[PDB]
Ligand binder design. Structure first.
Ligand SMILES: [Mg+2]
Ligand SMILES: [Zn+2]
Ligand SMILES: [Zn+2]
Ligand SMILES: [Zn+2]
Lengths: 196, 388, 49, 97, 263, 113, 47, 194, 140, 133, 49, 66
RNA sequence: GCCUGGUGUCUUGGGU
């Protein structure tokens, strides 16, 4: 609940996770680099407070602008047999060897947001076209194609990949054959191909 | 589509040419696109929900154009600032500082695994730095396996001698690290660093392997050392807080003196400025210097083992101001380049009396984020934040 | 909702003004084009009938 | 000395002033007083100062390339429709802007 | 040369000290008990009627998590290895459940004790949902109100925890060693004094503190591993430790077989 | 939709060998062993055991990608011993230690029964 | 072919005992839309 | 004529320092023995002192260096900045040559003085940006490489080649070939959408 | 009741404790402002509780007084996108799209204002056990 | 069979920066102006101030791919307590007799100061350092 | 429609990082890999393949 | 919705202890003590029972749709 | 017994 959002990068089965001496394994591992530049110190304090809360059996009051201090919560926690700042010794799951560093560990409220990958994944080979432009249709729900916009055009110029850019915008899209008159230059030719 | 087919990969908005580079496909289960982490920087990509686009060339001619002009290793150095745009980042960069510290030693059993983790390794285990009473390698030796031979680089930080008491600078001879902690100044994206040098001497193919080799070694080693951060790492001890509290208390007194002088016509006028501009200017300079002074005190008290300090020192995330704001003092809130305006008649909030120009009245947030902000300070902080 | 637009840049209708204290939320506002123009009533607010 | 407001021609003539080095941050006025080649250097100086200010560094040839385009016609061609589309380039190219 | 000293014991958890082995062997034993010791668990639910307020696969999902007596599971085959046509008596246990609420008032709570074994590889003691006592109703599955009915047929199969966590016989496995950090495998974080700020292991009194003068024994290795294996009741604690060792043997045996056959 | 079958971690396809030995001819007397459908569980056990033998000069393993249940081990021995034979010796030692270990647990268990 | 769209049970293999529907029956290798996970599998006719 | 990806900040060593420090670094006096080249770094040390004909080259060398320093300090880089983006980094090329040929050693060098002066001067005519014999092209070709030639001459000065870098015959000919090859490779490629 | 116009003419104490002068040096807790520009203040009103300046969405955040201000804005947006149990009658409504979390839990760290938003009765999330650690590099 | 040999008195032991490394400075008991600065691992070889240390420098331990030492063979290191292997990265041909030799033992640094007649043989590619007692 | 347009043979999804991929690789989901295609010309050297 | 069968984090069965927990609260025991009596010692198991919200009692009130 | 078409224009709310 602190603007610290992420996607799952991999899953690990129970026995490969790091574990504390009590055999508790985390459900979820977030990255330490998310904290110092974002300065969501409240996220850490919530973890600390919730640890205390689950040991003694109540929901801590985390209302803003109260007398609750970090030291008061830390005092309670140490009196229950845990290191007072929330750390715990943990063991690497692959080898059983201790980690040289201790790991901040505890409950945190996490929320499941509406953006799931199988609602976004999309691919198109060939497919339906617009009646008017004979270009691929717009949108996931219509088997559409991605937009090659003006800014992507410029990048291929910078690379000097002139051949690639031609193919993308013709053979891989709405290529059409027309006949012109060599004298007047208009597309006024009437071409019956079976009568030649 | 099959392994090693080239495809064009792209993230919008395409602000510059390295928004579109050619990658080699590797088919994998699960529904996300996978990127090696060192390419997140040129795309300005991260993994908080971003999506990216893939385009498949449809002929023999364009496959060759992709691999020989647009391919990732050719793009390591950008013409924008004649320097690399990709380096070692985040976990691997944080970890590589820790690993190349002077007192990191690794026993034999772990060393064998680490050597085998390097794809380009020639099969020759190097001799340990300590032979007796127990074979021990230093971190610098194993990192040096990932650097190809024939690479020379010298850099001097703060006039250090060849005996390097602070363990700073960098010296590399024949692809072997003689001394120096490896941090953002060497393996980051800066000009003249390690990545730039390998590119000139060995070409793009070898230089692309450099990223893969370094990453595979460090992430393994970091997996078995571990690294964390907790609430403890924001907390300065009781002695330092009194220093911190004094420097803020004395700064509030100087601001009182400035108000006294300006209201008794004893204030020097700055050139080009009215009295009220000069008054506002002097108060702002005092308060920003107060926070930096308080931040400097908090920083120096932190031990080397403190986890916040390790990330700031590596350059992987965070900077001096972040230590300052978490632990010492959030400091002055600004809106439109000026202090908080009197949006009520002659006052900033209805909890103050009129014509109050003191620090607390016009948006100085004295508390740290650790300590917690008061209700008045909170709103002012939300005003500055909204403007951003 | 404030019906000013998307035409007209600047900042004045978008800023969190001091007199919003206790009447509209200082935190809750959308990202993007509506940012600062769509606001939300604080918890104890009321509207005169 | 530094001034608010400009009058480059009149200030140059004032005895005491080093008339060979006086500079103005309005390159429109520079063009009228010193000519097109001096505008090139002044244009470059003012762009570089903007980019370099937040510590960034862009290699010389890119800013040099932009100011040569802006001065090739002998007058300052602005990067707006009133400048760009006054060129003898084809109609299909010009109408796409 | 490996030695074991059981500190405490009861039906569903064994606390023990393991000694004169390598760290890797203690860890591989930990992993094997969690992941590869076979058990029995529901793996197919045929819903003929479900008019409760819970969704069909929601109820089915809870069924998969019910621990079943798996004592004789070693003589049972995997479904994927059986020579038969569809299922039969040698590769599955069939369970049935039927509940209903008559009356216009009150709530009928459907409990795991209503799971009735219907067939199974007789006379092997497998397939009954585990119970603490005899008057223990067990695990809550659903709740029913007037006219709501639940009538399901469940197929239980042999499986391992690698495929899905419902087949795991353990819960947590507590595990620690070297309570006074003589090996120096960790470097303690501290504010003021490391010893006062870190709590003591619950096995601190089982080993002697380092003497204040004592030099660092750079040849010492980890040698005593205290662990506690808790189970869910699907297997008794002594069986899990025994079958963990047994399973790990066949895996190494299978590797040994392949080398002497590849020549 | 793209999740692989979880049973593929331990069930061997018919055209895929459980074990594959190839030489590393760049140095003398070195083999690469590719283990299919196995984990750290097996690999770490073999690795430490092997490292305490006097005639093993190099042993290492890596799990190249956690989404694929395989690993590859590299084993080099001195001129006298053949690596593949040494691997058999490491296997039989551990089977023996676990047999002993299982026995001593059974005895201690009845006393507490 | 007379067995498209008719309900089927699998009697051998890892999917033994599962219900499905014949989605496509080109030749020898069928496409059963399994009921149990949201996946359609390729499967031989002996099964 | 260069591609932006191929340049790096390099110091042009004839710009900073006093005239005295400059003279100490670059001047060779075949008359005054204590201001000549040290005898332990060359084999032919005997046939050196007094030779007025060899002194005519070294005077022309130092006169060339004086022109460059005067041109660069008064016209090109008035504020004294001497670190600038330039093509092909000579410092790295030299220290690689020191590694390939094991250029440690006090073993006096067999590399004669006329080979150095004529070698470097002939190099500066092969740094082709534009080819063709037209009179205007040669002036343009010379103008394009003016700054880079000064950079080379400031490094491959007689005292530095012999006392500091200690190149032999094999290594020095290699250094010239590498500079020549890498400068060509650093030209922008026609067709580039700059 | 006071509106914005009348609020201009009153003097508000932030908490009841500020109505009376006091008699600390706890280096962990936050510094209260000195308020030494006016010698004696004449308060006319007092806030009921200062946490009521927040709205519905921001009231779900535990400890918003310890966050950098954009994070509270970002959570206020994301909170409206989190699956929970939007009503208890979902089986009889036929909505275009609906999501119901299997096992909602009430949060271990709550605020007083959540009692009236019914958040503990219709929660929208779960308490995960979280380690903050660099593990395999698959979480950079 | 060795290149250099002497006995040193430890004047300073700087801990400060690290928990497992200390910098020591020493001067030869028999010949002043021969100074040794050396980083060493505290936990493996604890040193105190004023300790006497025999320091030998060899280019070989014999009386490329490292192997665990067999208990049957024998080398120069059997008679010493602390052995390190390193790279010579600077050979200073200094003023009258000020010679410094900088060696890097995997980032553990050494400076050896002394005279030409004592150190001329040390112009090597690699060096062992052996420390006794 | 002319300076930019929608195109065939494209795909899009959420991205994740992987340290155990080479710098110039991209991991592509199987389902996407079966929808996209490349028209390879048949020659004497690949006809059996 | 209804009490989970297993603790998410460690796997210990907790779905048979929900009825016992509500009864202990009628007798006036405090939440921490009630969990203690049920032998739920690790805090992963404690969160499961302490923070579950029983919504199924509300859904049953909606008079059956057959 | 091969081919095989399902909309648009807006507005609003969201994602980076
Ligand atoms: Mg993003
Ligand atoms: Zn015509
Ligand atoms: Zn059967
Ligand atoms: Zn639990």
């Amino acid at each position: 609940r602190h603007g610290q959002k992420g996607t799952i990068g991999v899953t690990y089965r129970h026995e490969d996770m790091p574990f504390s001496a009590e055999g508790i394994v985390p459900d979820l591992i977030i990255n330490p680099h998310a904290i110092p530049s974002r300065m969501t110190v409240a996220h850490l304090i919530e973890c600390l407070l919730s640890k205390v809360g689950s040991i003694r059996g109540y929901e801590g009051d985390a209302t803003p602008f109260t007398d609750l201090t970090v030291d008061a919560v830390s005092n309670l926690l140490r009196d229950n047999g845990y290191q007072s700042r929330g750390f715990e010794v943990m063991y690497n799951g692959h080898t059983g060897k201790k980690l040289m560093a201790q790991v901040f560990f505890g409950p945190t409220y996490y929320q499941r947001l509406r953006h799931m990958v199988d609602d976004k994944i999309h691919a198109r080979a060939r497919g339906p076209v617009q009646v008017l432009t004979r270009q691929p249709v717009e949108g996931r729900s219509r088997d559409g194609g991605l937009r090659f916009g003006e800014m992507e055009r410029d990048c291929m110029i910078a690379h000097g990949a002139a051949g690639f850019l031609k193919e993308r915008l013709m053979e891989a899209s709405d290529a059409f054959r027309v006949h012109v008159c060599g004298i007047c230059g208009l597309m006024s030719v009437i071409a019956n191909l079976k009568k030649n | 589509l099959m392994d090693d087919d080239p495809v064009l990969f792209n993230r919008q908005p395409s602000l510059h040419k390295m928004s579109m580079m050619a990658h080699r496909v590797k088919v994998m289960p699960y529904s996300t696109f996978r990127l090696n982490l060192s390419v997140t920087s040129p795309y300005n990509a991260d993994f908080d929900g971003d999506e990216m686009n893939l385009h498949v060339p449809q002929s023999e001619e364009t496959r060759a154009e992709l691999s020989q002009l647009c391919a990732v290793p050719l793009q390591i150095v950008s013409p924008q600032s004649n320097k690399p745009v990709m380096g070692i980042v985040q976990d691997t960069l944080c970890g590589v500082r820790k690993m190349t510290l002077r007192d990191t030693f690794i026993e034999y059993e772990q060393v064998m695994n680490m050597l085998f983790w390097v794809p380009s390794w020639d099969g020759v285990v190097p001799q340990p730095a300590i032979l007796k009473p127990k074979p021990l390698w230093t971190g610098k030796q194993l990192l040096s396996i990932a650097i190809p031979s024939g690479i020379h680089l010298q850099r001097t930080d703060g006039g250090n001698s060849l005996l390097s008491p602070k363990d700073n600078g960098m010296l590399i001879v024949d692809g072997k690290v003689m001394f120096g902690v490896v941090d953002k100044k060497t393996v980051g994206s800066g000009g003249g660093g390690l990545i730039h040098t390998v590119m000139r001497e060995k070409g793009p193919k070898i230089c692309a392997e450099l990223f893969g080799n370094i990453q595979k070694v460090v992430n393994y080693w970091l997996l078995h050392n571990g690294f964390s951060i907790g609430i403890g790492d924001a907390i300065a001890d009781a002695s330092t807080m009194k220093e911190i509290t004094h420097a803020i208390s004395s700064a509030k007194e100087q601001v009182q003196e400035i108000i006294y002088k300006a209201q008794h016509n004893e204030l020097e006028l700055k050139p080009g400025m009215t009295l009220r501009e000069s008054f506002e200017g002097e108060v702002s300079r005092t308060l920003n210097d107060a926070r930096d002074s308080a931040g400097r005190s908090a920083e120096m008290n932190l031990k080397d083992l403190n986890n916040v300090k390790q990330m700031v020192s590596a350059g992987s995330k965070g900077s001096f101001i972040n230590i300052a704001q978490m632990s010492a003092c959030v400091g002055q809130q600004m809106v439109e380049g000026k202090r908080i305006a009197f949006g009520f008649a002659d006052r900033s909030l209805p909890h103050f009396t009129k014509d109050d120009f003191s620090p607390e009245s016009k948006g100085f947030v004295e508390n740290s984020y650790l300590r917690g902000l008061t209700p008045q300070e909170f709103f002012f902080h939300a005003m500055a934040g909204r403007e951003g | 909702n404030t019906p000013i637009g998307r035409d007209g840049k600047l900042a004045k209708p978008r800023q969190l003004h001091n007199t919003h204290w206790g009447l509209v939320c200082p935190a809750e506002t959308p990202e993007g084009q509506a940012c600062g123009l769509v606001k939300n009533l604080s918890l104890l607010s009321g509207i005169s009938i | 000395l530094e001034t608010d407001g400009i009058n480059l021609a009149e200030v140059m003539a004032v005895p005491g002033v080093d008339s060979s080095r006086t500079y103005s941050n309005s390159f429109v006025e520079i063009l009228s007083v010193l000519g097109i080649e001096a505008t090139r250097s002044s244009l470059y100086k003012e762009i570089l100062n903007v980019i370099a200010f937040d510590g960034s560094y862009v290699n010389y040839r890119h800013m040099a390339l932009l100011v040569d385009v802006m001065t090739s016609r002998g007058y300052l061609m602005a990067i707006t429709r009133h400048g760009i589309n006054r060129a003898d380039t084809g109609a299909l190219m010009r109408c796409s802007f | 040369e490996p030695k074991v000293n059981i500190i405490n014991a009861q039906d569903d958890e064994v606390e023990l000290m393991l000694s004169d082995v390598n760290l890797s062997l203690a860890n591989s034993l930990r992993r094997t008990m969690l992941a590869e010791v076979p058990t029995l668990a529901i793996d197919l639910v045929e819903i003929k009627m479900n008019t409760s307020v819970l969704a069909d696969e929601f109820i089915s999902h809870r069924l998969g998590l019910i621990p079943l007596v798996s004592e004789d599971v070693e003589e049972m085959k995997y479904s994927r290895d059986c020579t038969c046509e569809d299922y039969c008596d040698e590769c599955s246990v069939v369970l049935e459940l039927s509940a209903r609420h008559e009356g216009e008032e009150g709530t009928t709570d459907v409990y795991s004790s209503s799971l009735i074994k219907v067939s199974g590889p007789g006379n092997l003691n497998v397939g009954e949902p585990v119970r603490r006592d005899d008057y223990d109703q067990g695990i809550l599955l659903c709740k029913l109100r007037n006219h709501q009915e639940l009538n399901i047929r469940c197929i239980a199969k042999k499986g391992i925890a690698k495929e899905h966590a419902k087949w795991s016989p353990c819960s947590a496995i507590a595990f620690e060693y070297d309570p006074h950090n003589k090996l120096k495998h960790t470097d303690f974080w501290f504010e003021v004094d490391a010893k006062k700020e870190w709590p003591d292991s619950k096995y601190a009194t089982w080993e002697e503190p380092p003497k204040p003068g004592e030099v660092f024994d750079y040849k010492a290795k980890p040698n005593r591993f205290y662990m506690t294996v808790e189970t869910t009741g699907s297997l008794k604690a002594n069986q899990v430790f025994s079958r963990g060792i047994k399973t790990l043997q066949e895996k190494l045996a299978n590797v040994l077989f392949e080398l002497e056959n590849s020549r | 939709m793209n999740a692989p079958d979880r049973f593929e971690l331990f069930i061997l396809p018919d055209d895929v060998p459980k074990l594959k030995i190839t030489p590393d001819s760049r140095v003398p007397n070195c083999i690469i062993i590719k283990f299919e459908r196995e984990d750290h569980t097996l690999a770490n056990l073999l690795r430490e055991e092997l490292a305490l033998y006097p005639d093993v000069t190099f042993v290492a393993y890596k799990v190249e990608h956690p989404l694929f249940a395989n690993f590859v081990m590299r084993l080099q021995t001195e001129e006298g011993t053949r690596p593949k034979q040494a691997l058999e010796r490491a296997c039989a030692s551990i089977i023996n230690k676990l047999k002993t270990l299982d026995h001593k647990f059974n005895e201690e268990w009845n006393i507490k029964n | 072919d007379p067995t498209l769209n008719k309900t089927v049970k699998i009697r051998q293999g890892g999917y033994k005992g599962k219900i499905g529907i014949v989605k496509e029956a080109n030749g020898d290798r069928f496409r059963v839309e399994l009921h149990n996970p949201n996946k359609t599998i390729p499967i031989p006719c002996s099964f | 004529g260069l591609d932006g990806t191929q340049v790096e900040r390099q110091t042009i060593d004839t710009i900073p320092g006093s005239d005295k420090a400059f003279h100490k670094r670059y001047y060779v006096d075949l008359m005054d023995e204590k201001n000549s080249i040290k005898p332990d770094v060359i084999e032919y040390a005997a046939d050196i002192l007094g030779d007025v004909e060899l002194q005519k080259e070294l005077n022309s060398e130092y006169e060339q260096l004086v022109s460059d320093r005067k041109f660069l300090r008064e016209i090109v880089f008035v504020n004294g900045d001497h670190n600038w983006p330039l093509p092909v980094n000579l410092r790295r090329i030299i220290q690689n040559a020191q590694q390939i040929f094991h250029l440690d050693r006090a073993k006096a060098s067999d590399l004669t003085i006329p080979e150095i002066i004529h070698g470097v001067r002939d190099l500066c005519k092969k740094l082709f940006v534009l080819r063709g014999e037209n009179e205007l092209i040669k002036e343009a070709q010379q103008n394009a490489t003016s700054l880079f030639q000064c950079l080379v001459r400031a490094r491959l000065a007689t005292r530095r080649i012999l006392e500091e870098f200690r190149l032999n015959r094999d290594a020095f000919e290699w250094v010239l070939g590498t500079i020549e090859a890498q400068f060509q490779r650093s030209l922008v490629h026609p067709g580039e959408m700059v | 009741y006071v509106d914005g116009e009348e609020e201009e003419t009153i003097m508000i104490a932030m908490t009841p404790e500020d109505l009376q002068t006091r008699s600390l040096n706890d280096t962990a807790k936050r510094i209260k402002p000195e308020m030494s520009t006016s010698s004696h203040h004449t308060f006319t009103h007092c806030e009921i509780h200062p946490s009521m300046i927040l709205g519905v969405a921001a009231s779900i955040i535990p400890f918003p007084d310890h966050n950098q201000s954009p994070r509270n804005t970002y959570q206020s947006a994301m909170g409206k996108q989190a699956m929970g149990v939007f009503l208890t009658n979902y089986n009889v409504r036929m909505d275009t799209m609906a999501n119901i979390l299997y096992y909602p839990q009430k949060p271990l760290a709550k605020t007083q204002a959540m009692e009236y938003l019914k958040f503990r009765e219709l929660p929208a999330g779960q308490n995960a056990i979280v380690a903050i650690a660099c593990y395999s590099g698959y979480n950079q | 069979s060795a290149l250099f040999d002497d006995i040193f008195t430890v004047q300073t032991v700087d801990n400060g920066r690290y928990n497992k490394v200390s910098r020591i400075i020493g001067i030869s008991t028999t010949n002043s102006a021969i100074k040794l600065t050396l980083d060493i691992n505290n936990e493996m070889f604890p040193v105190s101030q004023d300790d006497s240390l025999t320091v030998t420098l060899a280019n070989s331990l014999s009386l490329k791919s490292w192997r665990p030492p067999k208990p049957t063979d024998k080398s120069l290191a059997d008679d010493y307590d602390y052995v390190m292997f390193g790279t010579v990265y600077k050979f200073e041909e200094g003023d009258e007799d000020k010679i410094k030799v900088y060696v890097s033992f995997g980032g553990l640094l050494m400076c050896l100061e002394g005279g030409y007649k004592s150190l001329a043989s040390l112009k090597q590619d690699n060096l062992y350092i052996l420390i006794r007692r | 429609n002319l300076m930019g347009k929608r195109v065939d043979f494209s795909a899009r999804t959420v991205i994740s990082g992987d340290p155990n991929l080479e710098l110039d690789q991209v991991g592509v989901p199987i389902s996407i890999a079966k929808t996209l295609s490349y028209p390879e010309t048949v020659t004497q050297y690949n006809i059996h393949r | 919705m209804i009490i989970p069968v297993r603790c998410f984090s460690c796997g210990k069965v907790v779905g048979d202890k929900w009825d016992a927990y509500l009864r202990l609260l009628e007798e006036g025991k405090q939440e921490g003590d009630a969990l203690d009596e049920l032998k739920l010692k690790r805090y992963c198991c404690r969160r499961m029972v302490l923070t579950h919200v029983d919504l199924i009692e509300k859904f049953l009130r909606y008079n059956p749709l057959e």
